[PDB]
Design a protein around this ligand. Sequence first.
Ligand SMILES: [Mg+2]
Ligand SMILES: [Mg+2]
Ligand SMILES: [Mg+2]
Ligand SMILES: [Mg+2]
Ligand SMILES: [Mg+2]
Ligand SMILES: [Mg+2]
Ligand SMILES: [Mg+2]
Ligand SMILES: [Mg+2]
Ligand SMILES: [Mg+2]
Ligand SMILES: [Mg+2]
Ligand SMILES: [Mg+2]
Ligand SMILES: [Mg+2]
Ligand SMILES: [Mg+2]
Ligand SMILES: [Mg+2]
Ligand SMILES: [Mg+2]
Ligand SMILES: [Mg+2]
Ligand SMILES: [Mg+2]
Ligand SMILES: [Mg+2]
Ligand SMILES: [Mg+2]
Ligand SMILES: [Mg+2]
Ligand SMILES: [Mg+2]
Ligand SMILES: [Mg+2]
Ligand SMILES: [Mg+2]
Ligand SMILES: [Mg+2]
Ligand SMILES: [Mg+2]
Ligand SMILES: [Mg+2]
Ligand SMILES: [Mg+2]
Ligand SMILES: [Mg+2]
Ligand SMILES: [Mg+2]
Ligand SMILES: [Mg+2]
Ligand SMILES: [Mg+2]
Ligand SMILES: [Mg+2]
Ligand SMILES: [Mg+2]
Ligand SMILES: [Mg+2]
Ligand SMILES: [Mg+2]
Ligand SMILES: [Mg+2]
Ligand SMILES: [Mg+2]
Ligand SMILES: [Mg+2]
Ligand SMILES: [Mg+2]
Ligand SMILES: [Mg+2]
Ligand SMILES: [Mg+2]
Ligand SMILES: [Mg+2]
Ligand SMILES: [Mg+2]
Ligand SMILES: [Mg+2]
Ligand SMILES: [Mg+2]
Ligand SMILES: [Mg+2]
Ligand SMILES: [Mg+2]
Ligand SMILES: [Mg+2]
Ligand SMILES: [Mg+2]
Ligand SMILES: [Mg+2]
Ligand SMILES: [Mg+2]
Ligand SMILES: [Mg+2]
Ligand SMILES: [Mg+2]
Ligand SMILES: [Mg+2]
Ligand SMILES: [Mg+2]
Ligand SMILES: [Mg+2]
Ligand SMILES: [Mg+2]
Ligand SMILES: [Mg+2]
Ligand SMILES: [Mg+2]
Ligand SMILES: [Mg+2]
Ligand SMILES: [Mg+2]
Ligand SMILES: [Mg+2]
Ligand SMILES: [Mg+2]
Ligand SMILES: [Mg+2]
Ligand SMILES: [Mg+2]
Ligand SMILES: [Mg+2]
Lengths: 79, 66, 115, 177
Amino acid sequence: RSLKKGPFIDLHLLKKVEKAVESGDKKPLRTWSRRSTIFPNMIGLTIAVHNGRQHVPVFVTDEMVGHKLGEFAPTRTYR
Amino acid sequence: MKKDIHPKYEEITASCSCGNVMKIRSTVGHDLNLDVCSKCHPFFTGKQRDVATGGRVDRFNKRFNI
Amino acid sequence: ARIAGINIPDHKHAVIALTSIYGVGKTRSKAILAAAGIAEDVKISELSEGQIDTLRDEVAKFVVEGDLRREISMSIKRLMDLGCYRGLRHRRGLPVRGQRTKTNARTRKGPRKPI
Amino acid sequence: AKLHDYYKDEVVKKLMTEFNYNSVMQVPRVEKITLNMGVGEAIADKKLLDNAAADLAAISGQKPLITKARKSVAGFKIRQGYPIGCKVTLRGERMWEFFERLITIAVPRIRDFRGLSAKSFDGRGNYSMGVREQIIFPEIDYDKVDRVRGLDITITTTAKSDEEGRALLAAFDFPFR
RNA sequence: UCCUCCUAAAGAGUAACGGAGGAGCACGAAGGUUGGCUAAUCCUGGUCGGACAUCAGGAGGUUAGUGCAAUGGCAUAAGCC
RNA sequence: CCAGGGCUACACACGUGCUACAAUGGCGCAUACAAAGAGAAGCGACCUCGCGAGAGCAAGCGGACCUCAUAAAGUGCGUCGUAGUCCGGAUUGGAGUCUGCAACUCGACUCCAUGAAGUCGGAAUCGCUAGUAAUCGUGGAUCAGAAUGCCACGGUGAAUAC
RNA sequence: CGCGGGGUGGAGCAGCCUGGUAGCUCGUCGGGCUCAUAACCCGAAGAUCGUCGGUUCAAAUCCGGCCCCCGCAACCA
Ligand SMILES: [Mg+2]
Ligand SMILES: [Mg+2]
Ligand SMILES: [Mg+2]
Ligand SMILES: [Mg+2]
Ligand SMILES: [Mg+2]
Ligand SMILES: [Mg+2]
Ligand SMILES: [Mg+2]
Ligand SMILES: [Mg+2]
Ligand SMILES: [Mg+2]
Ligand SMILES: [Mg+2]
Ligand SMILES: [Mg+2]
Ligand SMILES: [Mg+2]
Ligand SMILES: [Mg+2]
Ligand SMILES: [Mg+2]
Ligand SMILES: [Mg+2]
Ligand SMILES: [Mg+2]
Ligand SMILES: [Mg+2]
Ligand SMILES: [Mg+2]
Ligand SMILES: [Mg+2]
Ligand SMILES: [Mg+2]
Ligand SMILES: [Mg+2]
Ligand SMILES: [Mg+2]
Ligand SMILES: [Mg+2]
Ligand SMILES: [Mg+2]
Ligand SMILES: [Mg+2]
Ligand SMILES: [Mg+2]
Ligand SMILES: [Mg+2]
Ligand SMILES: [Mg+2]
Ligand SMILES: [Mg+2]
Ligand SMILES: [Mg+2]
Ligand SMILES: [Mg+2]
Ligand SMILES: [Mg+2]
Ligand SMILES: [Mg+2]
Ligand SMILES: [Mg+2]
Ligand SMILES: [Mg+2]
Ligand SMILES: [Mg+2]
Ligand SMILES: [Mg+2]
Ligand SMILES: [Mg+2]
Ligand SMILES: [Mg+2]
Ligand SMILES: [Mg+2]
Ligand SMILES: [Mg+2]
Ligand SMILES: [Mg+2]
Ligand SMILES: [Mg+2]
Ligand SMILES: [Mg+2]
Ligand SMILES: [Mg+2]
Ligand SMILES: [Mg+2]
Ligand SMILES: [Mg+2]
Ligand SMILES: [Mg+2]
Ligand SMILES: [Mg+2]
Ligand SMILES: [Mg+2]
Ligand SMILES: [Mg+2]
Ligand SMILES: [Mg+2]
Ligand SMILES: [Mg+2]
Ligand SMILES: [Mg+2]
Ligand SMILES: [Mg+2]
Ligand SMILES: [Mg+2]
Ligand SMILES: [Mg+2]
Ligand SMILES: [Mg+2]
Ligand SMILES: [Mg+2]
Ligand SMILES: [Mg+2]
Ligand SMILES: [Mg+2]
Ligand SMILES: [Mg+2]
Ligand SMILES: [Mg+2]
Ligand SMILES: [Mg+2]
Ligand SMILES: [Mg+2]
Ligand SMILES: [Mg+2]
């Protein structure tokens, strides 16, 4: 996989997470950034990733870190 | 035991690469050579090394480091 | 000819002998014999027992056989429990590394079926 | 031989302190080891049994019994008094000699080894092992056999609870999970 | 034509185009005798092996078996060796 | 106009390729022979860091000069000796690399381990009449990156046409 | 109601009255040939055997009931 110069997250999602974590647990964050990675601080949040037509809630666990947000949001439905 | 019907149950010397010399009795032949034994097998360390493999958050910190 | 879990070849060069070990291939086997101080041109029949014991400690450094099999099994089983795109790919029985799935993919998908 | 002398001196005395036994005879002792080899595929090929018998005869000291089928069944296509498997019920002196040779050298040679099952008891202290390969024992030559066949070991004791029977085997430095 | 059960009314016998089944053999070991043995079916553990092949212990105890129907009988075993 | 998603879906069927199934071959060490291109937010030496993709410093060239650029087949020695093989090199896991705001859907390449089908292909059927078929490199266009396609280039070099 | 005989891929037939692994000719499906369809060539799938039951170690095949189908009898006055 790519990118050795800092794991990448969109400015907006970084600031939205930092604001969400410091306040406390609340609700699913409407975010479209699938490209963004998952930090350690994102654990506990049930952020809602855009599959394409709707937002899929994803409870972030200890394992979901190095992976990107789009991996937990299947786009193409089948059967 | 019934003599004649059984195979030859002779004594032999087991000697692994670790150094544990050990005489036993079995149907092999002249001598023996072994890799591991009850001593020298990694089960006491094996379970220590095998169980402590996981760790995803520190792996992320080892890349970013800030 | 009994190192690691299995390794029992005969009438085969020392480099090609250790390819039969799970977790050791071509270049790894050259690194074993380089560190052990054994020529690659010889075979296990030609070697003595004094030299085979040094190969046992050398392959013990690298993760091999049942240690490696579980490490791979853990990593595949991890992905499926997460419910990621790769996990759905694995359990469904379809190719993972962004491959074509329409014409080919016969290795992963298996042989042909009726309609 | 040595494990019987080790048992008499070192083990009993260890087991006496655990469950405060009033008598020396109360300690569980190992009665017999029954090596079993249900070859099964002898329906098609008759010699394949005699190949297994030789391998058991090599693994154990003594020669095996060819066990007949108890009843006829349609599932496997077998009839009354047909040789389906092989067995050895070794006990006494050669038993302790085999029991050393099993736990000390053979059990370590098991492929993909980790830790043997602690749950594996019958509810009466009688243990059993299931070895996949014949090659784990050093008696079998590598260029002789030509089948992925194995046996099962079955350690019989004079215990009464698997809880009681675990300690007996555990006292011989037996590898559990 | 021959065998078994009921009808058959607690000895035997007892009919009907009354009620149900079997036989026209098998075996130099399936006979003799001597010396042994104990079953079914489950439970739990165990390589491939799974409900079930083979092993271990525990449970039940004659539900078994008896060359073939059915009846009566058999652990002293007539059972299986 | 914008954020993602999709055009890359997958019981299946065909087309056109490519890589195979090996011994006229496979992997190692000694080393010889091309053409046609292409380059300024370009092509980027030699050095040094790299196991390698590559990472730095940066020389030169809008070029018969400078650079991508050692052509590979081919010899010459070695070793495997017909094995699902030291054949094939798929597939998976891990560790990476450059580009690029960004690489998970959905890139390319590298390293490591992994080592699938396949032992010359049913009915059929395709191209080809000489530097042509056959085989081994090589370049360019589009192009931040992304060819097994396309368009060009040159090596060894046949058989057969009654 | 009485005595024979049946019931097997989608169709018609074997295998069934001597219990151990189900064929044949068509059709359906996939690929060829053809401008295309047929014909033709090449592979492939497709029946637990009327059903409910018993006998057996095991039943399409043995035995019994029920459910259809087909033949023959159903007579003397
Ligand atoms: Mg759906
Ligand atoms: Mg490799
Ligand atoms: Mg390499
Ligand atoms: Mg690929
Ligand atoms: Mg795809
Ligand atoms: Mg009479
Ligand atoms: Mg009565
Ligand atoms: Mg009476
Ligand atoms: Mg009477
Ligand atoms: Mg009376
Ligand atoms: Mg009278
Ligand atoms: Mg009368
Ligand atoms: Mg009467
Ligand atoms: Mg009759
Ligand atoms: Mg006689
Ligand atoms: Mg007799
Ligand atoms: Mg007799
Ligand atoms: Mg006598
Ligand atoms: Mg008697
Ligand atoms: Mg009875
Ligand atoms: Mg009776
Ligand atoms: Mg008898
Ligand atoms: Mg397209
Ligand atoms: Mg692609
Ligand atoms: Mg379907
Ligand atoms: Mg095809
Ligand atoms: Mg190769
Ligand atoms: Mg090649
Ligand atoms: Mg130029
Ligand atoms: Mg240069
Ligand atoms: Mg250089
Ligand atoms: Mg390298
Ligand atoms: Mg960089
Ligand atoms: Mg540079
Ligand atoms: Mg100039
Ligand atoms: Mg110059
Ligand atoms: Mg170039
Ligand atoms: Mg140069
Ligand atoms: Mg170069
Ligand atoms: Mg140079
Ligand atoms: Mg070459
Ligand atoms: Mg293989
Ligand atoms: Mg094959
Ligand atoms: Mg590969
Ligand atoms: Mg291979
Ligand atoms: Mg071959
Ligand atoms: Mg050909
Ligand atoms: Mg060829
Ligand atoms: Mg043609
Ligand atoms: Mg043609
Ligand atoms: Mg012409
Ligand atoms: Mg080539
Ligand atoms: Mg190339
Ligand atoms: Mg090219
Ligand atoms: Mg270019
Ligand atoms: Mg090309
Ligand atoms: Mg090409
Ligand atoms: Mg029909
Ligand atoms: Mg048949
Ligand atoms: Mg037809
Ligand atoms: Mg067929
Ligand atoms: Mg069906
Ligand atoms: Mg019978
Ligand atoms: Mg019968
Ligand atoms: Mg049948
Ligand atoms: Mg028949």
